[PDB]
């Protein structure tokens, strides 16, 4: 993966692994990247359906903070 190597140190950009660092911080699942919100503080991803309560869709706000950060 070149000079910088993998973007993610934890999974090494292996798409066949679950990863709670570069994919959903709750379940590690890579599916539905379009429904994973990025926290504007910690930059972790979260499936709308992994949150509690689950969100139906992507919020229409300027920013979003995850449960760990908010």
């Amino acid at each position: 993966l070149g000079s910088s190597g993998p973007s993610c140190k934890h999974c090494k950009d292996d798409v066949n692994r679950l990863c709670r660092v570069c994919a959903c911080h709750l379940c590690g699942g890579r599916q539905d990247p379009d429904k994973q919100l990025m926290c504007d503080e910690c930059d972790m991803a979260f499936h709308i359906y992994c949150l509690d309560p689950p969100l139906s869709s992507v919020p229409s706000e300027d920013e979003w903070y995850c449960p760990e950060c908010r």
């Binding site: 990247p33 379009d34 990025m38 919020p59």
Partner: peptide, 25 residues
Amino acid sequence: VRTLLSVQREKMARLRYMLLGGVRT
């Protein structure tokens, strides 16, 4: 609100520019 997909697409776009297909020697 950014999604993981939007982040992945940004990265793909940047990489695409690096190919430099539009350059002759």
